[PDB]
Amino acid sequence: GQKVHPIGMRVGIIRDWDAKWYAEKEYAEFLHEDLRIRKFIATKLADAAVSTIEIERAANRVNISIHTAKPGMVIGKGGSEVENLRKELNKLTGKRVHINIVEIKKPDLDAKLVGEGIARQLENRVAFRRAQKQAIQRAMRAGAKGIKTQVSGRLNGADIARSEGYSEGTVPLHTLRADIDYAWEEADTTYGKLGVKVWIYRGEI
RNA sequence: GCGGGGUGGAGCAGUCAGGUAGCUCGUCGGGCUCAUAACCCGAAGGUCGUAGGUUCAAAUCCUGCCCCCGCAACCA
RNA sequence: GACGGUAUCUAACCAGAAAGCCACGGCUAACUACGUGCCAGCAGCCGCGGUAAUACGUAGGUGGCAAGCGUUGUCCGGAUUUAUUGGGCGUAAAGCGAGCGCAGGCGGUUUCUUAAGUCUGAUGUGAAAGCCCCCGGCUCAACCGGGGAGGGUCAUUGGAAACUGGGAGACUUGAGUGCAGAAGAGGAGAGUGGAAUUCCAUGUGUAGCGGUGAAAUGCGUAGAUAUAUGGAGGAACACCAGUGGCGAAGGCGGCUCUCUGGUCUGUAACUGACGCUGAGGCUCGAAAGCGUGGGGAGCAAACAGGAUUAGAUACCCUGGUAGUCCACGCCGUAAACGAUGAGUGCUAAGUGUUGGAGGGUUUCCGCCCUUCAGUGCUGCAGCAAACGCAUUAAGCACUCCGCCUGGGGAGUACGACCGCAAGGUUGAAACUCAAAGGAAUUGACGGGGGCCCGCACAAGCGGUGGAGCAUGUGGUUUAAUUCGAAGCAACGCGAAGAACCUUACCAGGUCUUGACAUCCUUUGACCACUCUAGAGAUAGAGCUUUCCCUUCGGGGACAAAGUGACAGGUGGUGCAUGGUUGUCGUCAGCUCGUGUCGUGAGAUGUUGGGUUAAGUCCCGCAACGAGCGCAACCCUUAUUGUUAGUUGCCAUCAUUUAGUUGGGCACUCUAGCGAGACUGCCGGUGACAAACCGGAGGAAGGUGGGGAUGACGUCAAAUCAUCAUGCCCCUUAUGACCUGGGCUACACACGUGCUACAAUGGGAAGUACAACGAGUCGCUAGACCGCGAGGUCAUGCAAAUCUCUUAAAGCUUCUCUCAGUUCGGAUUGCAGGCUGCAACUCGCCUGCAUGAAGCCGGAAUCGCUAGUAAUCGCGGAUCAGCACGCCGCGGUGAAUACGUUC
RNA sequence: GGAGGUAUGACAA
Ligand SMILES: [K+]
Ligand SMILES: [K+]
Ligand SMILES: [K+]
Ligand SMILES: [K+]
Ligand SMILES: [K+]
Ligand SMILES: [K+]
Ligand SMILES: [K+]
Ligand SMILES: [K+]
Ligand SMILES: [K+]
Ligand SMILES: [K+]
Ligand SMILES: [K+]
Ligand SMILES: [K+]
Ligand SMILES: [K+]
Ligand SMILES: [K+]
Ligand SMILES: [K+]
Ligand SMILES: [K+]
Ligand SMILES: [K+]
Ligand SMILES: [K+]
Ligand SMILES: [K+]
Ligand SMILES: [K+]
Ligand SMILES: [K+]
Ligand SMILES: [K+]
Ligand SMILES: [Mg+2]
Ligand SMILES: [Mg+2]
Ligand SMILES: [Mg+2]
Ligand SMILES: [Mg+2]
Ligand SMILES: [Mg+2]
Ligand SMILES: [Mg+2]
Ligand SMILES: [Mg+2]
Ligand SMILES: [Mg+2]
Ligand SMILES: [Mg+2]
Ligand SMILES: [Mg+2]
Ligand SMILES: [Mg+2]
Ligand SMILES: [Mg+2]
Ligand SMILES: [Mg+2]
Ligand SMILES: [Mg+2]
Ligand SMILES: [Mg+2]
Ligand SMILES: [Mg+2]
Ligand SMILES: [Mg+2]
Ligand SMILES: [Mg+2]
Ligand SMILES: [Mg+2]
Ligand SMILES: [Mg+2]
Ligand SMILES: [Mg+2]
Ligand SMILES: [Mg+2]
Ligand SMILES: [Mg+2]
Ligand SMILES: [Mg+2]
Ligand SMILES: [Mg+2]
């Protein structure tokens, strides 16, 4: 049967909102501005390993914390790339945008980054078992208490879609205290979308 | 010409011996069933072939008429 | 010298004239594109082809072979698939139903002899050519030549004597006889005994009896059933009785007698291999059946009637003929079964029991030991596909016999023999299939079993099904009635808001780089607005017409036009998909690692004894651990310490109409931090455990209540219409704009709801107590007008401050008086209120008027186990307006649970 | 614990 979103289950229990601002009359406007900001960043830095976007609002200002495993690539030489990003975002939003980059130590423990890697490899027609196996190995080396991965769709162009998954360690989705990260990524192939799901259980809080 | 029959869709009662239109199957609707059958609950369907008489009253009695069925319509 | 100017040799010239066939899914070496779409077609078998075909056709490649390649035909092989080499017959095909036996096959020990078999030598022959071995010739090879070898169940002849056979003896172990014993439903014949049934006779006696799931038929007042005494006759032999006995098998059970077979144990007197098997034959052979003649109680095909059933030529009931019985004679078949031919020898044990024998005891009885022949059970070695067999082999061996060779057709057809007949014995083919089959494994299932749980049933309360209306659906209708959902798990569902928009549908009016994108574009404003026509989209005029920098060349930001790439599909496929969700179900399960077991699929763990809500825990266990689940961590609710004390609270005080004001936060309250509940403690039960029962304390006790949380998976479940997306289709149209209409239709069927049918009520008046939530052009106070819906002015509040908001049931009085009503409030007329550009299609609401069905609802069916059902309101999401739906809140507040058969 | 006797359900997927 279906399962609650692993993150949504824990938001407000041990995980916090990414959109870290408060507003009453401008709630809808700020929320949609944030969504457009997130979409724009996703398009812009697609090649960079951008995972989490934390948005804070201070009056007309907007502070944006971007976590990435390639801070140099995001920054550019002498901050050229981050500065170009700021100007484009200022045009987009209509207000001062301050950007703060964060280094994602241990990229192997980020659900979105691991899932993105598997999706990229599938697009390149790597064996799905190989992609998932090496992802699990890297995660365990990084020190995840457990990891779980799943790929669904027309695997290897088969006419009947199915789901193939692997896991290692412990991933107790029902234990609320457990710090379990999750992310869903899609790989666009010749036969259509393949869904990639990654659960990463770190040290519980 | 001799008989037998026309009563709900079908098969039948009732008719002699006037008072009250039924039985079996069927049809329609709803149930039961995963579904169908069976089963269960409701409902419809004829003014008794037809026209006249008799009667207080006719599916029932009388007369005619029309349909349907079997038989006969000629023998040395 | 026919061949013949032939072979051959020499010299000149030229890569120039000289490579196809089949195959490429697996078997099988060889792979991709199109086209195709269960069509065309391929194919030796498996099998390919249903819109993404390495299997079809073409193409490009690749593999095999090559002047050949492939197809068909036929033979051998593979085929151990006729097994001499070299198979089998318990359950896969296969042991005749059993025995008696002629011929035949085979045969115990040993002395001598013989030399038929057997072994061996010599000789003769087994032509030549051809295979094979050496050696040669053609340029090689093919081919040719020379010399050898081989090839016989060969003939003659010489040897050997182990084995088989013959001949002459000997032997006693096998076989049989004698002698002494043992048991027995062995057979045949003639008698005979008791219980019971039925019938007959006679008493008593009265209204039933009998029978089924329930009934009926039937018997009975012409006296039944019952009951008592008798009589008749038939069949079978209770207790004993026992994997007990006996028989070759079929089979044989009261008792007695007569006739009669076999078996077993001793003994070692006798014979001295006389034995085993045994085609064909012969004999015997359950039950049913057949002929002749008897007999006939009970039972009982057929048959009759009563039931059951949709039907019931059956199961059930009441009767009942043949038959069952006897004699004689046929028949000759059975799952005639241990589904296992007979004989013989050999290969651990343990333990019953039948019939014996010997011994050591024991006074006897009896106990112990040994031993033979049966008969069971358990179990090594060994065997087996496995199940299993295992001194009573399916083990190890030898002899003889019967029998099997894929399934069906078929034990059929024809023929023959036998039979009175029924039929039996013998026994094919055409044709057709790629399976049939045995054992075991995992699931699923069972009108199998055991143990359990859930508002599953039971116990209860209230409903739906009946009526009106709201609402969804089917059906029908329509220009359209947009699309999706179809048992549980579709149908107050997507839709948390269809007059317009929404809107995807229809009619009509319209447009074509397009309503919306990115890229090139240019002599830059775009818009916006006024007027005109239009239903509007739109068009036709006027109207105004751009920002940002740099050094000034321009550029960048933005329109807008031109232009082509392109856009755009709520077009299709949820049987190509991602994502999301339903569902079993919050049920306790689902699995993995290592190890071990099994030939193997698999198994174990996860099972078992307890225990739990739980695969929860404990214990035991070839299992030891682990993971996803379970539980916990989380939210809310139930008590409370403390920090805080306004916008909240008011006890202490004084004042106000007012918690008002002052004053204080004490209380409540609010919300952070904590405390608290852990079977923690006590008693009893329990395997010293888990745990279970009870107790104390406490606000709360065993998960306190509730929520969130939904394992691996299941239904090609749902969604291409949230979104995204492979492939397919449309592209001046399936795309886009506008007006109107539709989605709201209405002979009918269903689901879900609301309102009722009244007195536990209707109406009137008075009076009291909540909670969750919402609020800026929004909640709206207060006042005034209005019968009312509402309207006017106007106030506070971005809110624990103000408002929505004095909640309704409730309680107290009055009235109605059982009435289709003073119930009911549908439909309808008129008149209004709002919201909105607009209320006809088609909104909600108000007043007056009208006053529908409805008198508690068939078959059937639903929810709920406590602050629950029932009932009463209040808020909110969507939202200009519009809910009987949904989400949430509080008020009042029960009945019942014996119990798990269904 | 074991052993001999006493109503229906096209076809493919
Ligand atoms: K092939
Ligand atoms: K053989
Ligand atoms: K036999
Ligand atoms: K000889
Ligand atoms: K005897
Ligand atoms: K007879
Ligand atoms: K037998
Ligand atoms: K014995
Ligand atoms: K055949
Ligand atoms: K009702
Ligand atoms: K209803
Ligand atoms: K689906
Ligand atoms: K799906
Ligand atoms: K294992
Ligand atoms: K507190
Ligand atoms: K779509
Ligand atoms: K699509
Ligand atoms: K329906
Ligand atoms: K309703
Ligand atoms: K009253
Ligand atoms: K309207
Ligand atoms: K509203
Ligand atoms: Mg190959
Ligand atoms: Mg081909
Ligand atoms: Mg052969
Ligand atoms: Mg068999
Ligand atoms: Mg057999
Ligand atoms: Mg007989
Ligand atoms: Mg009978
Ligand atoms: Mg036979
Ligand atoms: Mg024995
Ligand atoms: Mg009940
Ligand atoms: Mg109703
Ligand atoms: Mg509902
Ligand atoms: Mg519309
Ligand atoms: Mg329109
Ligand atoms: Mg299990
Ligand atoms: Mg567990
Ligand atoms: Mg265990
Ligand atoms: Mg849990
Ligand atoms: Mg489907
Ligand atoms: Mg569908
Ligand atoms: Mg589409
Ligand atoms: Mg509708
Ligand atoms: Mg009444
Ligand atoms: Mg319950
Ligand atoms: Mg309530």
Q: Which amino acid is at A96?
A: R
Three-state SS for A13? coil
| Residue A25 backbone dihedrals phi, psi, to 5 degrees | -80, -30
What is the distance in A from the centroid of ligand 38 to the CA of A106?
A: 33
What is the distance in A from the centroid of ligand 38 to the CA of A86?
A: 54
Determine the nucleotide nearest to A91 by Cα–C1' distance: C557
Between CA A58 and CA A117, with CA A15 as vertex, the angle to 5 degrees is 100
Residue-level length of chain A: 205
Number of Cβ within a 10 Å radius of residue A127: 12
DSSP notation for A87-112: HHHHHHHSS-EEEEEEE-S-GGG-HH
Q: What distance in Å separates the CA atoms of residue A142 and residue A194, rounded to the nearest whole number?
A: 26
Header resolution in angstroms: 2.9
Give the helix/strand (H/E) hosting A146.
Answer: strand A146-153
Pairing, β A192-201 against β A180-189: antiparallel
* Residue A192: C-alpha distances to residues A10, A66, A153, A162, A185 (Å): 32, 31, 8, 13, 13
- Name the residue among A156, A183, A178, A145 with its Cα closest to residue A18: A183
Angle (deg, nearest 10), helices A128-142 and A111-123: 150
Determine the nucleotide nearest to A159 by Cα–C1' distance: C576
Distance in Å from C142's C1' to A27's CA comes to 102
